[PDB]
Ligand binder design. Structure first.
Ligand SMILES: *[C@@H]1O[C@H](CO[C@@H]2O[C@@H](C)[C@@H](O)[C@@H](O)[C@@H]2O)[C@@H](O[C@@H]2O[C@H](CO)[C@@H](O[C@@H]3O[C@H](CO[C@H]4O[C@H](CO)[C@@H](O)[C@H](O)[C@@H]4O)[C@@H](O)[C@H](O[C@H]4O[C@H](CO)[C@@H](O)[C@H](O)[C@@H]4O)[C@@H]3O)[C@H](O)[C@H]2NC(C)=O)[C@H](O)[C@H]1NC(C)=O
Ligand SMILES: CCCCCCCC(=O)N[C@@H](CO[C@H]1O[C@H](CO)[C@H](O)[C@H](O)[C@H]1O)[C@H](O)[C@H](O)CCCC(=O)Nc1cccc(CCCCC)c1
Ligand SMILES: CCCCCCCCCCCCCCCC(=O)O
Ligand SMILES: *[C@@H]1O[C@H](CO)[C@@H](O)[C@H](O)[C@H]1NC(C)=O
Ligand SMILES: *[C@@H]1O[C@H](CO)[C@@H](O)[C@H](O)[C@H]1NC(C)=O
Lengths: 267, 98
């Protein structure tokens, strides 16, 4: 399962200042960036164009270029109309894309948040407010829904463009997507918290456990997965022990990249 | 409005005198405007690289900062974060293990 997410972040500070920036992810790998300051969508992989021809890419990009300008105008105009009831500063976020399933096609999504709260989605053939969204949104969404050409374009992008472009990305980015990077591990710490650090692994799935011989220590607390800057992962696993019980303990790491040869680090 | 969480950890095992990379992962903040510095002995490190800002499923923002560092037992390292959710800057010191 690969989830393609286009993530748009728009900050409207006052009447004269706004910016829209975007990032695009295929799973946990960034494929695109689109800065406010740039007219064009930037590639963050050699394969970020997928299977698309140069002309096909320029057209899709052109459509996003038109959209970014229209969206910025639409929001400023909306705020003017709503004033002073809805006012600056304003944060709008969009999360749109598709989740690719094994063999069988895909589901697509387009979610919109206002001031950090989910408020609007596109679903089926129309935009809709979600239950609990501020009621002042109902009127502008009804208006947006009257725009058939936009609705047709959005339906096309979600249902067709997204899974097709992503199937192209999966092919073109295969060696990157299927890359294997080996973890490196190290230990640190009368009641000690023992810490097993595991860094530099890719892909994300990993198994890290404190052991006494062959016995898994169920007191092992796994931390959050933290990103390294080099598209690899960092994880720690901690075990709370009493003093003079540390002897015979080990941290064991299993990961796809290691080829059945676990890391075992004895305290 | 949500308070940034700060996590400071190294890319490779921290060995004294060996060049390494220190990470500062800042998460769960809103709004996205944020100021992030990394510190050596309380002073700002000049060359700190930043990931693009992005956001999670729950819509909270995250960003990764990182800098080259050589740990020694005479140097402290920290990540300092300024954000509207907080009255003063929040500093998290590298705990020398992470
Ligand atoms: C793109 O795909 C859309 C569906 O996919 C979902 O949404 C997209 C955006 C992605 O997020 C994807 O991942 C999602 O899964 C698709 O939307 C569908 O469009 C058709 C018509 O074009 C809709 O059919 C009409 O349904 C209503 C009833 O709707 C309700 O009931 C059903 C269950 O019974 C639910 O699924 C809905 O949520 C609603 O609660 C009918 O009343 C209506 O019948 C009338 O109209 C037809 C002509 O169209 C006449 O023949 C009849 O006699 C009636 O007069 C339609 O049959 C469908 O609801 C809608 N799906 C959803 C989930 O809303 C969209 O069309 C695709 N677009 C393109 C360009 O490919
Ligand atoms: C990620 C979605 C990208 C899809 C591209 C949308 C197509 C587009 O750029 N349409 C704008 C020009 O429309 C004209 O040209 C079209 C063909 O190029 C058609 O022919 C169309 O008929 C014609 O009108 C259009 O201006 C559109 O409205 C852009 C707005 C995008 C949008 O959501 N706005 C929006 C508006 C209100 C509310 C929300 C979400 C709630 C936010 C909380 C405040 C979002
Ligand atoms: C609306 C989502 C459609 C997905 C179609 C896949 C082709 C998108 C290519 C990624 C570049 C878009 C980056 C801009 C993000 C935005 O402003 O919404
Ligand atoms: C609008 O907001 C920006 C960014 O927050 C700020 O620097 C600027 O002073 C404001 N501009 C005006 C004209 O008030
Ligand atoms: C962002 O880009 C738009 C269009 O190029 C521009 O008008 C606007 O001033 C930019 N905003 C900032 C904050 O740079």
């Amino acid at each position: 399962n690969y989830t393609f997410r286009c993530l748009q972040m728009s900050s409207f500070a006052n009447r004269s200042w706004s910016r829209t920036d975007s990032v695009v992810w295929l799973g946990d790998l960034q494929t695109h960036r689109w800065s406010n300051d740039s007219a064009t969508i930037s590639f963050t992989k050699p394969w970020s164009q997928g299977k698309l021809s140069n002309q096909q890419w320029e057209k899709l990009q052109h459509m996003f270029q038109v959209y970014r300008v229209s969206f910025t105008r639409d929001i400023q105009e909306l705020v003017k109309m709503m004033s002073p009831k809805e006012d600056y500063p304003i944060e709008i976020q969009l999360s749109a894309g598709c989740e690719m399933y094994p063999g069988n096609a895909s589901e697509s999504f387009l979610h919109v948040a206002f001031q950090g709260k989910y408020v609007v989605r596109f679903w089926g053939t129309s935009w809709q407010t979600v239950p609990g969204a501020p009621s002042w949104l109902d009127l502008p969404i009804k208006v947006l829904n009257a725009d058939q050409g936009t609705s047709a374009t959005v339906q096309m992008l979600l249902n067709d463009t997204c899974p097709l472009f992503v199937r192209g990305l999966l092919e073109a980015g295969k060696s990157d997507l299927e890359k294997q990077e080996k973890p490196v591990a190290w230990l640190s710490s009368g009641h000690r918290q023992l810490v097993c650090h595991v860094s530099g692994f890719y892909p994300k799935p990993v198994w890290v456990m404190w052991m006494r011989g062959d016995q898994e220590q169920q007191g092992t607390h796994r931390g959050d997965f933290l990103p390294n800057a080099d598209e690899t992962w960092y994880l720690q696993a901690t075990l709370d022990v009493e003093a003079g019980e540390e002897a015979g303990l080990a941290c064991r790491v299993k990961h796809s990249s290691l080829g059945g040869q676990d890391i075992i680090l004895y305290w | 409005q949500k308070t940034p969480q700060i996590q400071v950890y190294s890319r490779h095992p921290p060995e004294n005198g060996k060049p390494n990379i220190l990470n500062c992962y800042v998460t769960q903040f809103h709004p996205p405007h944020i100021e992030i510095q990394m510190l050596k002995n309380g002073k700002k490190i000049p060359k700190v690289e930043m990931s693009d800002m992005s956001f999670s499923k729950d819509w909270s923002f995250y960003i990764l900062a990182h800098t080259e560092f050589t740990p020694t037992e005479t140097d402290t390292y920290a990540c300092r974060v300024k954000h509207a959710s907080m009255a003063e800057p929040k500093t998290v010191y590298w705990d020398r293990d992470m």
